[PDB]
Amino acid sequence: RTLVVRRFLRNRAAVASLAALLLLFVSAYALPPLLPYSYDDLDFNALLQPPGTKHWLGTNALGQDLLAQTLRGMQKSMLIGVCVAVISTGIAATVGAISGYFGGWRDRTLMWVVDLLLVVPSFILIAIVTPRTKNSANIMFLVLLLAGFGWMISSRMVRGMTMSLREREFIRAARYMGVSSRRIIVGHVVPNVASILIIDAALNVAAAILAETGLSFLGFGIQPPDVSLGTLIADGTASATAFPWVFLFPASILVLILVCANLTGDGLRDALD
Amino acid sequence: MTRYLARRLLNYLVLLALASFLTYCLTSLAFSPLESLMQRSPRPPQAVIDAKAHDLGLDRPILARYANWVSHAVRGDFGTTITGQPVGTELGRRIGVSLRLLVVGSVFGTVAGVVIGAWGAIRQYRLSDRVMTTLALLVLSTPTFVVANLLILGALRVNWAVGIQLFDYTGETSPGVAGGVWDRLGDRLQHLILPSLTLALAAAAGFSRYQRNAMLDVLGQDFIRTARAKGLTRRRALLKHGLRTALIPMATLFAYGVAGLVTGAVFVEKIFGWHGMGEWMVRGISTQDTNIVAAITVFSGAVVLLAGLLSDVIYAALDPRVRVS
Amino acid sequence: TTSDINQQDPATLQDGGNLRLSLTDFPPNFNILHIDGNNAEVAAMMKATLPRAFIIGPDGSTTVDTNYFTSIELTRTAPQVVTYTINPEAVWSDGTPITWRDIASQIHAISGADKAFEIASSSGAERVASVTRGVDDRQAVVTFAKPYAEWRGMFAGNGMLLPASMTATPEAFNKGQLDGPGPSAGPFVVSALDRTAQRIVLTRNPRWWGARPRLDSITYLVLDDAARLPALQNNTIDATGVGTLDQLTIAARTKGISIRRAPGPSWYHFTLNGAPGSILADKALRLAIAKGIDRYTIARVAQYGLTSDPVPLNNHVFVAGQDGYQDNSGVVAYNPEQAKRELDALGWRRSGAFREKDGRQLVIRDLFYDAQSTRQFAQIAQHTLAQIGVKLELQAKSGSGFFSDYVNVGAFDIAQFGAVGDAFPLSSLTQIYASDGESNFGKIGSPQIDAAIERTLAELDPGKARALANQVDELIWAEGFSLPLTQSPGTVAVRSTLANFGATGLADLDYTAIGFMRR
Amino acid sequence: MSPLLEVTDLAVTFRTDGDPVTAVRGISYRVEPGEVVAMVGESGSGKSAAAMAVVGLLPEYAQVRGSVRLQGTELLGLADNAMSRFRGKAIGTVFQDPMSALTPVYTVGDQIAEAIEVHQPRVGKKAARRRAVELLDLVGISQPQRRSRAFPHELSGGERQRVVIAIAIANDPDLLICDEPTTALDVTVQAQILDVLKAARDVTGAGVLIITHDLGVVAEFADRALVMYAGRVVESAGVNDLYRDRRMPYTVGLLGSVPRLDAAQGTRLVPIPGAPPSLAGLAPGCPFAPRCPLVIDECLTAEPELLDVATDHRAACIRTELVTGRSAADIYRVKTEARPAALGDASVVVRVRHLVKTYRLAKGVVLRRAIGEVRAVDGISLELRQGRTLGIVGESGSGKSTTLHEILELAAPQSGSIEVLGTDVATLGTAERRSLRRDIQVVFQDPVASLDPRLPVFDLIAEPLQANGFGKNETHARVAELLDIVGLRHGDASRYPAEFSGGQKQRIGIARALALQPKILALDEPVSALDVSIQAGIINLLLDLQEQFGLSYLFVSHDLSVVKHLAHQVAVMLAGTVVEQGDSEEVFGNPKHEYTRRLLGAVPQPDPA
Numbered sequence A: 001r002t003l004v005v006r007r008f009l010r011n012r013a014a015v016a017s018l019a020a021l022l023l024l025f026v027s028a029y030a031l032p033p034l035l036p037y038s039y040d041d042l043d044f045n046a047l048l049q050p051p052g053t054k055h056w057l058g059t060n061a062l063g064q065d066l067l068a069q070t071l072r073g074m075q076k077s078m079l080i081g082v083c084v085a086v087i088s089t090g091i092a093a094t095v096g097a098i099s100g101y102f103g104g105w106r107d108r109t110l111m112w113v114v115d116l117l118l119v120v121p122s123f124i125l126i127a128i129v130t131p132r133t134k135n136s137a138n139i140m141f142l143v144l145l146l147a148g149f150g151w152m153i154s155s156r157m158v159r160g161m162t163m164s165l166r167e168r169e170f171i172r173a174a175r176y177m178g179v180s181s182r183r184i185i186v187g188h189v190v191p192n193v194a195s196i197l198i199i200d201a202a203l204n205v206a207a208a209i210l211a212e213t214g215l216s217f218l219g220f221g222i223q224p225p226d227v228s229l230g231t232l233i234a235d236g237t238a239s240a241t242a243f244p245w246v247f248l249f250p251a252s253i254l255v256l257i258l259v260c261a262n263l264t265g266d267g268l269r270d271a272l273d
Numbered sequence B: 001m002t003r004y005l006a007r008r009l010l011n012y013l014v015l016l017a018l019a020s021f022l023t024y025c026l027t028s029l030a031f032s033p034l035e036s037l038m039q040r041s042p043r044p045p046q047a048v049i050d051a052k053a054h055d056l057g058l059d060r061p062i063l064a065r066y067a068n069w070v071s072h073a074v075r076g077d078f079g080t081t082i083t084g085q086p087v088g089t090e091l092g093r094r095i096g097v098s099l100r101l102l103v104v105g106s107v108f109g110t111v112a113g114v115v116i117g118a119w120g121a122i123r124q125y126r127l128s129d130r131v132m133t134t135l136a137l138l139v140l141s142t143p144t145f146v147v148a149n150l151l152i153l154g155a156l157r158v159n160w161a162v163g164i165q166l167f168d169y170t171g172e173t174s175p176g177v178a179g180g181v182w183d184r185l186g187d188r189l190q191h192l193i194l195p196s197l198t199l200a201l202a203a204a205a206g207f208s209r210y211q212r213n214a215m216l217d218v219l220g221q222d223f224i225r226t227a228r229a230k231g232l233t234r235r236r237a238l239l240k241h242g243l244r245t246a247l248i249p250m251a252t253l254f255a256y257g258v259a260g261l262v263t264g265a266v267f268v269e270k271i272f273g274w275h276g277m278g279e280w281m282v283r284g285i286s287t288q289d290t291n292i293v294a295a296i297t298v299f300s301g302a303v304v305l306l307a308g309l310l311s312d313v314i315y316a317a318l319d320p321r322v323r324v325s
Numbered sequence C: 001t002t003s004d005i006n007q008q009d010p011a012t013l014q015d016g017g018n019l020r021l022s023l024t025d026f027p028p029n030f031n032i033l034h035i036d037g038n039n040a041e042v043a044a045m046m047k048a049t050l051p052r053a054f055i056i057g058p059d060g061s062t063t064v065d066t067n068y069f070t071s072i073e074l075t076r077t078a079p080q081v082v083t084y085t086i087n088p089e090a091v092w093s094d095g096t097p098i099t100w101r102d103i104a105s106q107i108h109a110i111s112g113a114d115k116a117f118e119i120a121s122s123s124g125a126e127r128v129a130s131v132t133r134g135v136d137d138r139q140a141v142v143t144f145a146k147p148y149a150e151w152r153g154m155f156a157g158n159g160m161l162l163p164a165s166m167t168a169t170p171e172a173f174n175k176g177q178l179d180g181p182g183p184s185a186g187p188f189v190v191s192a193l194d195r196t197a198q199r200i201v202l203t204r205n206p207r208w209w210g211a212r213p214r215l216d217s218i219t220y221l222v223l224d225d226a227a228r229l230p231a232l233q234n235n236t237i238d239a240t241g242v243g244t245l246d247q248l249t250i251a252a253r254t255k256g257i258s259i260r261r262a263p264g265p266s267w268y269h270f271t272l273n274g275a276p277g278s279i280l281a282d283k284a285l286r287l288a289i290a291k292g293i294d295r296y297t298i299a300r301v302a303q304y305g306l307t308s309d310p311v312p313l314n315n316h317v318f319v320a321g322q323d324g325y326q327d328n329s330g331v332v333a334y335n336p337e338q339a340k341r342e343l344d345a346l347g348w349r350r351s352g353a354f355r356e357k358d359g360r361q362l363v364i365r366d367l368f369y370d371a372q373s374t375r376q377f378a379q380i381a382q383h384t385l386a387q388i389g390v391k392l393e394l395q396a397k398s399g400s401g402f403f404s405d406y407v408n409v410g411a412f413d414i415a416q417f418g419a420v421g422d423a424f425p426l427s428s429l430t431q432i433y434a435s436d437g438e439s440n441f442g443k444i445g446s447p448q449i450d451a452a453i454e455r456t457l458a459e460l461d462p463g464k465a466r467a468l469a470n471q472v473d474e475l476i477w478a479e480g481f482s483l484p485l486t487q488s489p490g491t492v493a494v495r496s497t498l499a500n501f502g503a504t505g506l507a508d509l510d511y512t513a514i515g516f517m518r519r
Numbered sequence D: 001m002s003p004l005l006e007v008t009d010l011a012v013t014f015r016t017d018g019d020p021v022t023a024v025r026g027i028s029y030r031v032e033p034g035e036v037v038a039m040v041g042e043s044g045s046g047k048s049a050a051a052m053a054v055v056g057l058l059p060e061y062a063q064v065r066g067s068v069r070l071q072g073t074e075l076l077g078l079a080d081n082a083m084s085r086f087r088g089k090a091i092g093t094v095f096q097d098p099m100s101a102l103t104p105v106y107t108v109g110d111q112i113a114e115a116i117e118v119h120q121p122r123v124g125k126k127a128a129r130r131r132a133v134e135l136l137d138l139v140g141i142s143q144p145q146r147r148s149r150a151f152p153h154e155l156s157g158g159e160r161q162r163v164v165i166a167i168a169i170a171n172d173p174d175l176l177i178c179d180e181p182t183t184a185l186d187v188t189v190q191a192q193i194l195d196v197l198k199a200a201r202d203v204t205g206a207g208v209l210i211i212t213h214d215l216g217v218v219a220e221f222a223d224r225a226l227v228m229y230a231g232r233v234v235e236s237a238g239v240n241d242l243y244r245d246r247r248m249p250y251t252v253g254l255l256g257s258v259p260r261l262d263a264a265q266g267t268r269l270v271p272i273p274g275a276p277p278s279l280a281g282l283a284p285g286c287p288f289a290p291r292c293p294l295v296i297d298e299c300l301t302a303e304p305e306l307l308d309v310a311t312d313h314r315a316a317c318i319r320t321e322l323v324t325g326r327s328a329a330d331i332y333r334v335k336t337e338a339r340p341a342a343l344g345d346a347s348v349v350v351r352v353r354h355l356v357k358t359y360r361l362a363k364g365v366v367l368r369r370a371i372g373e374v375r376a377v378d379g380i381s382l383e384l385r386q387g388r389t390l391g392i393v394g395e396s397g398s399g400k401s402t403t404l405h406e407i408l409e410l411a412a413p414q415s416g417s418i419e420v421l422g423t424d425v426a427t428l429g430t431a432e433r434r435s436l437r438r439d440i441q442v443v444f445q446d447p448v449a450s451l452d453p454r455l456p457v458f459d460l461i462a463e464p465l466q467a468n469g470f471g472k473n474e475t476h477a478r479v480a481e482l483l484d485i486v487g488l489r490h491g492d493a494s495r496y497p498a499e500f501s502g503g504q505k506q507r508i509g510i511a512r513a514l515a516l517q518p519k520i521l522a523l524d525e526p527v528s529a530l531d532v533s534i535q536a537g538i539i540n541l542l543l544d545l546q547e548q549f550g551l552s553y554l555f556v557s558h559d560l561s562v563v564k565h566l567a568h569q570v571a572v573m574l575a576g577t578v579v580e581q582g583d584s585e586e587v588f589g590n591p592k593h594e595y596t597r598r599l600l601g602a603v604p605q606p607d608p609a
């Protein structure tokens, strides 16, 4: 643990990115109660304004403050991304582990099922199902869908890992002395797979944010009067030519988030060589 | 060869046949096309509902509905939309429009990505690698719609600043162009510049990283050193002996990049106003119409599996460990 | 008022050149009276090539057209006889002289006495009694049965005159004008319709008794309404109506393109459902909700960078340009301190958040077209009603199903869509504003308004007809009928070389003078 | 005449994150035509760095100084497009690992054709391919015309090494550079490769620089030797002088710890303690000082120089006067006498009859078919007595490791009967199976894969104890006693495995196997893959443990020099059949079968006389 941490600590870009992500999450949840304008208030005397001394990041075509809208979009989008990444990693881990542990025709059938699921792009299937989830206050169902249709590409890596590590010598050595199978599982496989599961979650974070925001752009995701980042971008592109800030500010924020996530993922991966 | 390229085709046929079924039960469960005509405050008389449901086929279980759907699809009939118009009339045009874009985007993306990945893995940790591996990060970290809208903004700025219409970003072709094949072809390319560039950026971004990892793995082996120990130069041994052996893994990842391109084409088509399968899919899920979507998912599965099969042919042609053992 | 064409004298304008305009679809039927045939775009096309009796100034004032009818003059009042006299020197495109036969044929076709036709409406030719011979062959004399005030509405404005050979026999009217029009009398004549190429072309007429067009061709394309701005950028078409601020900004930053604005007669409005069963069933609640929505704010926010100082439209019959447009809006003033005060006194006391009668809650359904521009009005009305407790639930219906499934049969409590004013507005009423008559969705109406609507257009004097129409306007504002939100600021972006062509709003263009700026 | 190769003051230092490792520090030598010079040494001594620096194929971060002159023209600082004119046409390189030394997408005949086609430009492919077939015949690949179209994955390791040699000698070079060409090869294959190399040197007439770590190859191929330690030559003389009249103490230790088939069972070796120095930032003085059995303080002030000791003999030591004529045991002060074997128990602890194990072969990736039954285990009958050792010897593909791992599963095989301590494992319920696993424990092959990478040594050693019912008061004492028995310091009980050095990991593996005081150890090649000077220490440890405790081993190995030392009985295995058995001395001195004598004839012996 200590050597790994000080291996990551070395990666200045990765730690900077991770600190930026934590800062953005904390500010998204803690700053809005301090701003002069709430996200729902409408200021009809200042429409499409540049960043000024009253609306710190300007307003959109309706007079809504842009800062508060962006913060609420960040809340929704980042929370969904994190939750979906966690659930997808859990599902992928369980399926890949069982498939790679049983071996034989169970493994063949499970991997064939995974391929059959991968035959059609995941975005298409999610968009097909989404009419049911939409029109529902709880975002639980959207998270459940995004997680349940996004695990099939990493479960293959998990299965490769399980197969590779099941045959490694110290497992057989533990067998040859009377170590109970439960003790093997709690003591020999979990410590050696936990870190790579963490890495997988770190990348599925960005994957899920991308999927959810792309969904919201077309109108299938989060529906008004709630706002996600994709919704803000979709509204902004309507009047992007006249006043471009309304499109370029949320877009920039989104790109920043994604860059940070990707950087952290890569850094963490290269810190577990 | 023609025992690994045959058992690899029955597999694709079975996969497609089962996918075209599982994504019809999924569609017929998710979509309820009458949920708005059974909820109006002056709710219409029941006999209207029965007539509309019978006309739309939602009276028999899912299995019978799917059986009739296949019995008609194999005979070139694809049902009707929710407003009466047939699907077969539009299907050919939409397929053509989508394929024109996908082929160009994929070809340019994979070629550029392979070249950049090889260059980065050869010149590891030099300045060029450092700049390229972060440009790939940026391109991979911005969603498709952000890229498309930024390109539209840039094109508008360029047109306004220069003073003439350099770039066009609307429709597959421009209206009112009478002329021969050459005029129409130049016009078509003028429009094809940007939408295909949008997909090429993402494809190159992904394939650069994948190729860089593959070539790094190859450079960690000893046949390059052997090849240079016979008198080959560094470049001749790196290209003839090292790059070709690194090209093998790429032929297995092509069917994944193609799925990514299919996903991104929906956005590229919605934003630039192209009339293809992405626009049709958005229009089909917006109104919850079963036959449009049932055709689009079949087309998507077929295009992924075709790319997979061609990639497997390439992989057999390049790698001798499958032609003979 | 004050149309905003590039006023240049016709003589100095160069002789020749094309004029490439746009359409939305190839007209399946060319007959301009047949129900499918008629439309805004097709009527606009045929405007250039047909005869009309009256030409309307920038404010709806009608003056006789000396080209075609030397003098259309009413002569009596008890039977309402009007003497339409044809120009001595006038004939069709096939050389058959124009005579009263054409007038009689078209009046009979529009009469609806024999329902072998699909005429749009019998307005103006249902009250006709008899048109017969004059002193000379080139004069008709129309005697009416019920006195009429709008009588200029036939052979004028949006309705032109048709050849006798095409309106006499019912089969011809039904099915005749499908592949090109028949004879025409207008300074241009249609010469080619490349249905395979999606294009119409008009060319100078050989037999024009009047002036010479400063043009040569008005070739019409069929561009869809999305590649209509990006095709004025190229040299494909040179005219377009720009709607939003986005495309207004795009067009203004272009070489050779100038933006011209004179308010068009196209407004956009709320309408309330008064059928029994919906919440907006009673006069008082309907009239107290409308006193808690800011129309001035809705206008000033909706069209931000389209006009300067945008005020809403506050008259039901006349649009801003017309004459006789006084502010008829004193019954609702937006104050939420008289709205909320007779609202709770009415019996809708305030509960948690939104107020409710305890047997029901204020929830009002607001179906609107799914577009982005139409959503702003709903999102502003919703926020300005929330301060009163009226929860406005806004359902974004879209496209084709909006006027058939949901609006056409109640299925709504407040619906927003656009009407279209005209320089002859006295017929929009007795259609929309009455107990019966189609297009009165949300069947609100009273016996007195129906009694005072047959007196506004049984008059014989415009100076009094306008007063009666505005009294009707009082009667319709006074009972929660509908809220006229905005008037579209007709902005057309045209090639800066065009002259005597641009945004004229309600007024009518002169197709003999359009031409091109010299060189 | 300009000498064929002259290296002077060569120095090679890579660069890493921390200190720059100075791999080679100032060596110098000279190779003449028709002569063989062997650089001996082991672990990290910079032999391979010197080879790849002479050739020019060092990685792109290694920094090289000094002087290297090939027949007259210098090679350091030549551009790549100018140094590639010598490679292949005057230098022929043979590399270490054959299993990944050939590009896998070209037919081997085409790879030799490319070798012979780049340096002679106008040969024409029609002649290059014919010459490639001639070379394939010359090296000794069977029936070469057909095999000239075989991709590299369709050949065994010996075939691949033969193809690499064919590539090396394609253009008739003038200097061969062999970089451990016969490690990771079977014994007989290695003998054949040495014959091939001798034939290549005779036909070519070149001079060879062979880089080995074993002494038999040096005594059987080379003509002079240079012993390398810590990146410097420490002794250099003829092979006969080096084996007979060595002077540097490192050479004494290196030659005293090489097992010999001549030795009787139970003879101890002479292990050099410690581990080779880390080359990043040496301390001053002799690099051998930390491990030298004669080290005095003078040896620490300054580093000795390669000094002339005898006629054509140089030693880098200052106390050689005390090494001449003294046997390695005398210098290192060890007793190599085999202790008189006491009368042990003569009972039988393992007994296998007629054992057989099958393996199906399947062709087809997605769908598998049944075409053949390879019998890697066919009809084996062996047995083991108390206090003795039975060494199973065979080559790769002989089904000895699988026989061991089949015995260790303690289950009923397809045929034959397995007796362990008197219980026929077919009649063994799982309770008795758990009760018996406390009397036979296994020592694995790969030290680093047989240990949990992220567990302190205490946990690894106490795993058998914790899993079998010992309290936290007792496992502490038992683990403390075990570290002293094996040889590690108590202070290592809190150190992770990854920081131990090669031999200590195997020592920990032995300790873990030794926890429950079993009566049988099953050793699976646990000493190969180690430096010779560490093999000696572990071998002595095993012999002493058997002498003192009374253990019984089951020793599976591929080389026979140590099996002579350890095993009391032997069992030669061929393709899954035990072809010979009996007491070790009789089999190893008077063999009968043809395979056994082929095997014994193919083992090198470090006697050059």
Ligand code: SF4
Residues within 6 Å of the ligand: D248, D249, D250, D286, D287, D288, D289, D292, D293, D294, D295, D296, D299, D304, D316, D317, D318, D319, D320
């Ligand atoms: S010089 Fe000294 S330390 Fe070095 S090997 Fe000789 S005696 Fe040992």
